């Protein structure tokens, strides 16, 4: 599970601070890498790791803003004094107890073969 | 003549004791091979080693069909002989093989003698003194 | 546990002579069943060992032979001038194999763990490697094999959260 | 032969000669027995005993 | 306080206490050599 | 360089001889010879040097030159002798029991060695297994 982490993980820049625009502007997809860069960050998420998969197959537009709706995620590694290393984050991302649980689900929901609401 | 039964003819002239011939009989067969295989120019040691060996457990091979020897403390005391060998030809050449090849009278046990006695340092400890203070020489040099 | 770095050479002569690797920490075990120039070529590995093992885990590195043996001399008991004889020619040894291996210079070595006990962590130093620009970039690539045995190993007592703060288990995410 | 010693109870007044392989190995069947041993478990928990 | 003998701050010593930790003693592991599983 | 000189004992008249044997071995450890030659190019280089070598002697206290030369040959010769193997009980006693063998060796090992080595017929069966071997080395794949 590390070893595939880092090649999917692994670019020029920090993976997560590319996602910084794209179609996730004030999706559940961008609250998701919120909420993940925190758990390196802190071990606490808003939204449990079993919950997220079903948010995020049916991605409602209801209500996204309710999770995070003042940081981003350019912003999260400076405000929480994170390393944009690659390897870095992923040793901060495994050392929390439930790190590796966190991971191998985290890797499934961002390039696993997740059935997607058209 | 296969070569399995001529060492092993050979192997059954060694005087016996008791459990204690299968030490004698191994190094016998360790000592004779590993300092009689030639070396190839093209490989270093690593491989030289691992092509002598292999060649050298062929042979236990044939002989353990004539006289029974331990295969594995035979090929302990080939390692050990083969690694002396390769030292000697890559290292330092001791010099009781200049005398005994070689005017040659007075030896290295007439001067650890005297070291001993006084507490000194010794034929070997001199001799590692000499290459060091003879690095700084050759390195400079060529 | 104790790793105890040794070359090929002298891992395969444990293995193929079946010498007890249990007490290779025991210096009067290990010197009976080892050669004046295997006990130099150990503290030889020992000082290439590139690596910085988890102290925080009580992981060390193990004391040279050579040490042991010079420490025994000065100690008081019946086998202490054989012990003082022995570190004279382990000295000897040593400069003259230092004197000839002295041009290896710039090259790093593979690393096989082969765990003994939780006391003793044997590690082969094998075949060599050049490298001379960012040696300590290819030693780390080069090892990958030596980082998993490792954590693999202590992952069985330490706990997993700790192991995963120390720098063998970045070795190997940087490796791969 | 060789010589090991134990300070159990169990053995008050007991010599045993058992055999074993002259060299040792791993997972080797000549030794008279084997212990097969898995890291004993270390578990560390909160428990809300009582 | 005509007498000042010394009641208080005596020479404290600390007595070792050093256990070794091993999978099997000596005895039980010569006799029952250790095999990972 | 005569710090450690000074730290040989004397003895006889021995003492340029001594050192001439000395001086010849650390030059001998430092310049290897590359298996990949024979024994002329390689050779002709290593004697070549240390001959350059020998004119720093008047930095020494008695080194026997021409001595020294016929020490520092001898050592190739040997070295070529035991890269294409050698058989003759009279040169594999030396090498057996010897300064370099006793470090390889471990003191059980040495005892053996010294009870083969030193049987009365250690040099006529040493002596027919190097024929046996010589003869049919090649016959092992």
């Known amino acids: 599970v590390l070893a595939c982490a880092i090649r999917l993980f692994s670019g020029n820049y920090n993976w997560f601070i590319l996602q910084d625009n794209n179609s996730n502007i004030d999706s559940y997809n961008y609250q998701f890498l919120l909420d993940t860069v925190r758990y390196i960050a802190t071990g606490h998420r808003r939204i449990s790791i079993t919950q997220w998969p079903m948010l995020l197959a049916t991605e409602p537009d209801a209500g996204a803003q309710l999770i995070e709706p003042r940081a981003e995620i350019a912003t999260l590694f400076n405000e929480l004094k994170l390393d944009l290393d690659t390897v870095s984050m992923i040793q901060n991302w495994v050392k929390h107890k439930n790190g590796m649980n966190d991971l191998m689900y985290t890797l499934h929901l961002l390039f696993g073969s997740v059935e997607v609401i058209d | 003549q296969q070569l399995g039964f001529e060492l092993s003819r050979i192997l059954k002239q060694l005087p016996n004791l008791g459990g204690s011939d299968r030490k004698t009989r191994a190094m016998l067969l360790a000592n004779a091979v590993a300092l009689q295989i030639p070396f190839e120019t093209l490989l270093d040691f690593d491989e030289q080693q691992d092509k002598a060996v292999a060649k050298f457990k062929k042979i236990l091979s044939k002989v353990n069909e004539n006289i029974a020897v331990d295969t594995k403390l035979a090929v302990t005391y080939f390692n050990n002989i083969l690694r002396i060998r390769q030292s000697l030809i890559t290292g330092i050449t001791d010099p009781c093989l200049v005398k005994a090849v070689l005017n040659d009278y007075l030896t290295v046990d007439d001067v650890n003698i005297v070291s001993a006695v006084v507490n000194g340092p010794d034929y070997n400890r001199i001799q590692a003194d000499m290459g060091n203070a003879l690095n700084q020489l050759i390195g400079s040099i060529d | 546990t104790q790793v105890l770095v040794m070359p090929k050479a002298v891992f395969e002569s444990y293995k193929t002579a079946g010498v007890q690797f249990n007490k290779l920490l025991d210096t009067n075990y290990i010197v009976s069943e080892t050669s004046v120039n295997d006990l130099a070529e150990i503290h030889q590995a020992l000082t290439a060992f590139p690596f910085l093992l988890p102290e925080k885990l009580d992981i060390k590195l193990a004391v040279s032979p050579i040490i042991k043996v010079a420490e025994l001399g000065e100690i008081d008991g019946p086998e202490q001038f054989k012990m003082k004889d022995l570190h004279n020619r382990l000295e000897s040894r040593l400069a003259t194999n230092e004197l000839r291996d002295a041009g290896n210079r710039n090259l790093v070595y593979d690393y096989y763990l082969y765990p003994v006990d939780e006391n003793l962590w044997v590690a082969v130093q094998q075949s060599a490697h050049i490298a001379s620009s960012d040696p300590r970039r290819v030693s780390i690539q080069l090892n990958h094999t030596f980082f998993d045995s490792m954590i693999n190993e202590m992952l069985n007592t330490r706990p997993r959260e700790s192991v995963a703060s120390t720098q063998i288990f970045t070795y190997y995410l940087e490796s791969c | ?50 | 306080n005509y007498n000042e003998k010394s009641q208080r701050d005596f020479r404290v010593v600390t007595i070792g206490y050093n256990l070794a930790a091993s999978r099997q003693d000596e005895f039980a592991e010569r006799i029952y050599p250790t095999t990972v599983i």
């Not at chain 4, 080797?28 to 890291?39: E, M, P």
Request: glycine letters at 6%.
């Open chain 4, 1 to 50: 032969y060789d010589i090991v010693s134990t300070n159990n109870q169990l053995f008050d007044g007991k010599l045993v000669v058992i055999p074993t392989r002259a060299v040792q190995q791993e997972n080797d069947i000549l030794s008279w027995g084997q212990f097969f041993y898995v890291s004993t478990v270390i578990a560390d928990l909160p428990i809300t005993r009582g």
